[PDB]
Design a protein around this ligand. Structure first.
Ligand SMILES: COc1ccc(OC(C)C)cc1Nc1cncc(-c2ccc(C(=O)O)cc2)n1
Length: 331
């Protein structure tokens, strides 16, 4: 009767110690700027719930990015906005500069700093061992910050990392699925891209936490060092867990579901089976070898765990030997 509760190991009570206004985003009143300050230059991209454009702020002639929202519940808009305001000035977090509405179509639009983002296809082929370490460290700065500020991103994946390679500059974007961590709270598991979903989402364990982001970071790392995009290539949410089980093995999977008393979907009985835990060498080849080191594999192994309580925290990850070269060079 019932699954076993879980609390974050770190930053557990951080929102509790804050004024209510910090996390109680439904009570946030939105401060609207002037839509006539911005002229759209060109469309940059389309999304599930948004279209993005380059624009000009005509008052200062600064380049800017405008995310025009497709219709979504005002609660979810206030969440993204609140989270972005709370995180403003944090390391490698995209800056929200303004918020406007078309006066006619009443469609809201978020205005962001511009990053001169480099071709993601072109970039993720040209990356040295050192680059991966450097940018991974940069992402962890953002994740430790937002986690320490009581926020889970819940959509960490390469499309949500903007890199200006020229200036060695990284920004974590798209805070539209982000949520405030409160101990006890049961969250929606229908979040994140399939290939980056953590086991807790896949087995429908709802009392998850910041450590979700650390799984998805692990998925990113794996694809970058092994030059295999995506690393876990499931055909759907069920086969996604199987693709994970064929690598981390089923023994730790069933220990996980046992520890938390998770009612496993019966559909899984058929497809999951029995699989051994593989070693990482099975993914090392001559093409990717220059990216792979003992340090990288040790690090990766400690992100990619079924049990969310057992994964590295962002701060622990930043202290790992994989990053010694990077930490020395920063000071
Ligand atoms: C050449 O620059 C681009 C080409 C395509 C593109 O596609 C988007 C749909 C990701 C974005 C950009 N550039 C930029 C530059 N600075 C910021 C952003 C940005 C994009 C999205 C978000 C968000 O979803 O919160 C926040 C910021 N985006």
């Amino acid at each position: 009767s019932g699954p076993v509760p879980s609390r974050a190991r770190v930053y557990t009570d951080v929102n509790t110690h804050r004024p209510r206004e910090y996390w109680d985003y439904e009570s946030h009143v939105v401060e609207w700027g002037n839509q006539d300050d911005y002229q759209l230059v060109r469309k940059l991209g389309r999304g599930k719930y948004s279209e993005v454009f380059e624009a000009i702020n005509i008052t200062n002639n600064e380049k800017v990015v405008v995310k025009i929202l497709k219709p979504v519940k005002k609660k979810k808009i206030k969440r993204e906005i609140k989270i972005l305001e709370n995180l403003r000035g944090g390391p490698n977090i995209i800056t929200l500069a303004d918020i406007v509405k078309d006066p006619v179509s009443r469609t809201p639009a978020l205005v962001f700093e511009h990053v001169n983002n480099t071709d993601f296809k072109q970039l993720y082929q040209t990356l040295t061992d050192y680059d991966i370490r450097f940018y991974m460290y940069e992402i962890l700065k953002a994740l430790d910050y937002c986690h320490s500020m009581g926020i889970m991103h819940r959509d960490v994946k390469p499309h949500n990392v903007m890199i200006d390679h020229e200036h060695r500059k990284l920004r974590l974007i798209d805070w539209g699925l982000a949520e405030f961590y409160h101990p006890g709270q049961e969250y929606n598991v229908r979040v994140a891209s399939r290939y980056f979903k953590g086991p807790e989402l896949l087995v429908d364990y709802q009392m998850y936490d910041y450590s979700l982001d650390m799984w998805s970071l692990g998925c990113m790392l794996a694809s970058m060092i092994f030059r295999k995009e995506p690393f876990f290539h499931g055909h759907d949410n069920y086969d996604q867990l199987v693709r994970i089980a064929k690598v981390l093995g089923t023994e730790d999977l069933y220990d996980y579901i046992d520890k938390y008393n998770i009612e496993l979907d019966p559909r899984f009985n058929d497809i999951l089976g029995r699989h051994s835990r593989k070693r990482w060498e099975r993914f090392v080849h001559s093409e990717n070898q220059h990216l792979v080191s003992p340090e990288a594999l040790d690090f990766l192994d400690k992100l990619l765990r079924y049990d969310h309580q057992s994964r590295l925290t962002a701060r622990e990850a930043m202290e790992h030997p994989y990053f010694y070269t990077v930490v020395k060079d920063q000071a």
